[PDB]
Amino acid sequence: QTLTYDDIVGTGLANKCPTLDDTARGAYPIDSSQTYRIARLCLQPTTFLVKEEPKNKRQEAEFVPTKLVTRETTSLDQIQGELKVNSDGSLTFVEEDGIDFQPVTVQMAGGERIPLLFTVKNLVASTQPNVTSITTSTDFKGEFNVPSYRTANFLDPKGRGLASGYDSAIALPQAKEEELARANVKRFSLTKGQISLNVAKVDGRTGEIAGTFESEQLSDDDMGAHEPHEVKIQGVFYASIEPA
Amino acid sequence: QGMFVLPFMARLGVTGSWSGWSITGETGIDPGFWSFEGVALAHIVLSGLLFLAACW
Amino acid sequence: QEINRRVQASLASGATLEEAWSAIPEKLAFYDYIGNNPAKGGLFRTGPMNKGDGIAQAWKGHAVFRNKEGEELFVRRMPAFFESFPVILTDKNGVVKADIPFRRAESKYSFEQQGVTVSFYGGELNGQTFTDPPTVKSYARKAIFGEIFEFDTETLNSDGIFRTSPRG
Amino acid sequence: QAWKGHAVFRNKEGEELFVRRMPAFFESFPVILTDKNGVVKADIPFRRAESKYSFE
Amino acid sequence: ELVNVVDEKLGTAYGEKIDLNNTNIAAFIQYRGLYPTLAKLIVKNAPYESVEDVLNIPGLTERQKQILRENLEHFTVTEVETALVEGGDRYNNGLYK
Ligand code: CLA
Ligand code: CLA
Ligand SMILES: CC1=C(/C=C/C(C)=C/C=C/C(C)=C/C=C/C=C(C)/C=C/C=C(C)/C=C/C2=C(C)CCCC2(C)C)C(C)(C)CCC1
Ligand SMILES: CC1=C(/C=C/C(C)=C/C=C/C(C)=C/C=C/C=C(C)/C=C/C=C(C)/C=C/C2=C(C)CCCC2(C)C)C(C)(C)CCC1
Ligand SMILES: CCCCCCCS[C@@H]1O[C@H](CO)[C@@H](O)[C@H](O)[C@H]1O
Ligand SMILES: CCCCCCCS[C@@H]1O[C@H](CO)[C@@H](O)[C@H](O)[C@H]1O
Ligand SMILES: CCCCCCCS[C@@H]1O[C@H](CO)[C@@H](O)[C@H](O)[C@H]1O
Ligand SMILES: CCCCCCCS[C@@H]1O[C@H](CO)[C@@H](O)[C@H](O)[C@H]1O
Ligand SMILES: [Ca+2]
Ligand SMILES: [Ca+2]
């Protein structure tokens, strides 16, 4: 039955979420007197779409396909948190910890590279009210935090940074500073993302669920040097629910 | 954009780049070898082979 | 040294600090600026010195830095060897009192911590005082080059990088 | 970058006025607005002193 | 105007004391008795509306509370700065010797 590290190593399978049999169409009872957790949440992105930015501003921009260039390094996994049963019988997942982010670079037609911090950091996601069992009709929707793709020590190629680094363009000792302020003064972004988790499979007996997700968030803004893009990520997920 | 040869490639069916765009504005098209770059490459190689033949 | 001599003579004879500095010829202050040192150029940095720091327009005046305690602080000047140099201010005895840190997490001497201010005597800025850290830091960065000048960088599209003079 | 949209000109009476277009031959061209029947209704004058048709 | 938020924080109490809401955890080595046991509890239970709230952390022994009272004059609190607390930076801020 079960794979070891040596069976998996270098195959690509380590970046894949667990799947459930087509047979898994059951219902997982929620006892509202019981406390629960998600012991493992896994998100495997299969598509990154980036919202093109028109000059038009007439007609809406579309989300376009992109090519992943950072290889099989994209999934979020080993994530855990409390699954609260709320007074209206809705469930709320409160992400606590795990491998809950991955830097990802995707490339648009024509070469523009779009790095992003693909993440569900601090996810708080909730189902519909009265979810007395988790079934293939359950979904979770919620919000998460998207911190700056680089953290505060990151130094640009000229040595400039937020918590470290020069604070000016030292190669242009007598340039007028005003035109360079946006490059010289690093800023740390913190914005919100949104995600939907759509259950497609439930094993009533094991507490395991799998489905598809779609999340939306901003990409890297290079510590405030440029405007971020809007990204939409789609893929599959797996979670194991446990009494706890 | 002052493009003089690009339209001649486009007139006969070369509309995509290896980098993923097309002149009609599509994304994720795969043009095969015969993108604008592959046409440019084929002509450069042709040139070299012709030059060598001239020497002979 | 000559500028300081003249200012001290002015003060001794009873001038105010503003008047003492206002008596310094702009021509003299301009020789006390590293942008005019011929050992600050580059072999392929071509043209007039004006192409680099810009066409000099006016002396800003003499910058005097002070910390929150009101002690006079002195910016350490850039020696000609150095293409870039840190910003370090000491008291009259060479003790370090303020700087622009690189790593911030264990900074002790930041201008924000030490409440560094700058006041100008003579030149364009005579009588003015700036207390906001970005502006005070900006002037401290210029004080490493010696006396501070206003430049026109637009007319020649000057790039900000020092060139040598005909002496070099 | 973008179409500004179609400009419709009108005089103080509300009549639609049409700007006379530049023919290719002309490097420069006067600014003259006529009603739908080609009658002149407004223009940008060169000499102002006996102007009758200024936009003002 | 664009502002460097770390430099700006240095002109508040964060630049003068251990900020229970922001300061990296090695800073608690400065005073007897704070590191690693209390330092960990403090960072873990942050942010605090006021310095005294540090006395309200659950499970504390009496000796621990007393150590906290003796050290309140070395503590401050300021608003949480995202640039200082992201990245797990309060635990490891990339500075060694
Ligand atoms: C080996 C085959 C080959 C192929 C498949 C291509 C293909 C291409 N070339 Mg390249 N090319 C080649 C060889 C080739 N070329 C050679 C040997 C040269 C050196 C002379 C070139 C030099 C060249 C240039 C300078 C250009 C191209 C361009 C192009 C593109 C448009 C072609 C076009 O519009 O032609 C148009 C051709 C005609 C209209 C042919 C006219 C034939 C006349 C009317 C015949 C008169 C005599 C005839 C005997 C009359 C009796 C006929 C009988 C049937 C009744 C296309 C990608 C263009 C481009 O996009 O470059 C990037 C371009 O500008 N090529
Ligand atoms: C003693 C020679 C001499 C000196 C000291 C100067 C000095 C100056 N000139 Mg004048 N000039 C000269 C001769 C000189 N000039 C000559 C002969 C002409 C006619 C070409 C000019 C025409 C001229 C113009 C038109 C201008 C100046 C300007 C200037 C200023 C900028 C200089 C600069 O940017 O250099 C840059 C120097 C270099 C980039 C170094 C070049 C090094 C070469 C390329 C090395 C070659 C290596 C060799 C090929 C190796 C061989 C290897 C082999 C043996 C194996 C400076 C005051 C500028 C100015 O500000 O005017 C008001 C200006 O616009 N000059
Ligand atoms: C000036 C002018 C003119 C004229 C012009 C001309 C006439 C030009 C020409 C141009 C040309 C005529 C160009 C050419 C180019 C070419 C090239 C660029 C080539 C390349 C090649 C190569 C690179 C190759 C390689 C090789 C070999 C050799 C061998 C085999 C293999 C190989 C492929 C590798 C006119 C009248 C219009 C008027 C205006 C001005
Ligand atoms: C088919 C085809 C095609 C086309 C093709 C072509 C058009 C081709 C051509 C080809 C060619 C065009 C070829 C050529 C070749 C050449 C050669 C092979 C040469 C050689 C040479 C030599 C060998 C020389 C030598 C020498 C020298 C170099 C020096 C001096 C001395 C001597 C003389 C010895 C295409 C792509 C459309 C696609 C489909 C298929
Ligand atoms: C004959 C080989 C020529 C080398 C071709 C270079 C790659 S192809 C090149 O890629 C760029 C970046 O994606 C695009 O922006 C550009 O439109 C495209 O022509
Ligand atoms: C010296 C360059 C040789 C590189 C050739 C790469 C071929 S790539 C290949 O090309 C075919 C013809 O267009 C297409 O039909 C096919 O879909 C494409 O994958
Ligand atoms: C002289 C060797 C250089 C030749 C490079 C061959 C490019 S081959 C080219 O690659 C594209 C992606 O870049 C694909 O869309 C396309 O199917 C393929 O034909
Ligand atoms: C942040 C700007 C406010 C403080 C003034 C900056 C120091 S002084 C400043 O230095 C520039 C070279 O960097 C010169 O081009 C300019 O003429 C001069 O006004
Ligand atoms: Ca479903
Ligand atoms: Ca410029």
From Swiss-Prot, chain A:
Cofactor descriptive note: PSII binds multiple chlorophylls, carotenoids and specific lipids.
Cellular localization per UniProt: Cellular thylakoid membrane
Principal cellular location given in the protein's record: membrane
Keyword Manganese applies: yes
InterPro entries: OMP/PagP_b-brl, PsbO
An annotated GO cellular component: plasma membrane-derived thylakoid membrane
Membrane topology designation: Peripheral membrane protein
Pfam families associated with the record: MSP (PF01716)
Keyword Thylakoid included in the entry's annotation: yes
Keyword line: Manganese, Membrane, Photosynthesis, Photosystem II, Thylakoid
Entry's Gene Ontology BP terms: photosystem II assembly; photosystem II stabilization
Any one Gene Ontology molecular-function term assigned to this protein's record: oxygen evolving activity
Subunit architecture: PSII is composed of 1 copy each of membrane proteins PsbA, PsbB, PsbC, PsbD, PsbE, PsbF, PsbH, PsbI, PsbJ, PsbK, PsbL, PsbM, PsbT, PsbX, PsbY, PsbZ, Psb30/Ycf12, peripheral proteins PsbO, CyanoQ (PsbQ), PsbU, PsbV and a large number of cofactors. It forms dimeric complexes.
Alphabetized PANTHER family for the sequence: OXYGEN-EVOLVING ENHANCER PROTEIN 1-2, CHLOROPLASTIC
Biological role: One of the extrinsic, lumenal subunits of photosystem II (PSII), which stabilize and protect the oxygen-evolving complex. PSII is a light-driven water plastoquinone oxidoreductase, using light energy to abstract electrons from H(2)O, generating a proton gradient subsequently used for ATP formation. Required for dimerization of PSII and for binding of PsbQ to PSII.
Entry similarity comment: Belongs to the PsbO family.
Name of the protein: Photosystem II extrinsic protein O
Organism of provenance: Thermostichus vulcanus
Lineage: Bacteria, Bacillati, Cyanobacteriota, Cyanophyceae, Thermostichales
Recorded name of the encoding gene: psbO
UniProtKB/Swiss-Prot annotation, chain B:
Positions bound to chlorophyll a 8: 43
Residues in compartment: Lumenal: 1-43
Signal peptide: none
Superkingdom, natural source: Bacteria
Cellular localisation: Cellular thylakoid membrane
Disulfide bond entries: none
Parts of the chain that traverse the membrane: 44-56
Subunit structure, as described in the record: PSII is composed of 1 copy each of membrane proteins PsbA, PsbB, PsbC, PsbD, PsbE, PsbF, PsbH, PsbI, PsbJ, PsbK, PsbL, PsbM, PsbT, PsbX, PsbY, PsbZ, Psb30/Ycf12, peripheral proteins PsbO, CyanoQ (PsbQ), PsbU, PsbV and a large number of cofactors. It forms dimeric complexes.
Family affiliation: Belongs to the PsbB/PsbC family. PsbB subfamily.
Functional summary from the UniProt entry: One of the components of the core complex of photosystem II (PSII). It binds chlorophyll and helps catalyze the primary light-induced photochemical processes of PSII. PSII is a light-driven water:plastoquinone oxidoreductase, using light energy to abstract electrons from H(2)O, generating O(2) and a proton gradient subsequently used for ATP formation.
Identification of the protein by name: Photosystem II CP47 reaction center protein
Species assigned in the record: Thermostichus vulcanus (Synechococcus vulcanus)
High-level lineage: Bacteria, Bacillati, Cyanobacteriota, Cyanophyceae, Thermostichales
The encoding gene: psbB
Residues of the full protein shown: 57 to 112 of 505
From Swiss-Prot, chain E:
Primary localization class, coarse: membrane
Cofactor note: PSII binds multiple chlorophylls, carotenoids and specific lipids.
The organism's place on the tree of life at top rank: Bacteria
Topology within the bilayer: Peripheral membrane protein
GO cellular component: extrinsic component of membrane; photosystem II oxygen evolving complex; plasma membrane-derived thylakoid membrane
Annotated compartments: Cellular thylakoid membrane
GO biological process: photosynthesis; photosystem II stabilization
Keywords assigned: Electron transport, Membrane, Photosynthesis, Photosystem II, Thylakoid, Transport
Annotated NCBIfam families: PRK02515.1
Subunit note: PSII is composed of 1 copy each of membrane proteins PsbA, PsbB, PsbC, PsbD, PsbE, PsbF, PsbH, PsbI, PsbJ, PsbK, PsbL, PsbM, PsbT, PsbX, PsbY, PsbZ, Psb30/Ycf12, peripheral proteins PsbO, CyanoQ (PsbQ), PsbU, PsbV and a large number of cofactors. It forms dimeric complexes.
Stated role: One of the extrinsic, lumenal subunits of photosystem II (PSII). PSII is a light-driven water plastoquinone oxidoreductase, using light energy to abstract electrons from H(2)O, generating a proton gradient subsequently used for ATP formation. The extrinsic proteins stabilize the structure of photosystem II oxygen-evolving complex (OEC), the ion environment of oxygen evolution and protect the OEC against heat-induced inactivation. Requires cytochrome c-550 (PsbV) or OEC3 (PsbO) to bind to photosystem II (PSII).
Family: Belongs to the PsbU family.
Name used for this protein in its record: Photosystem II extrinsic protein U
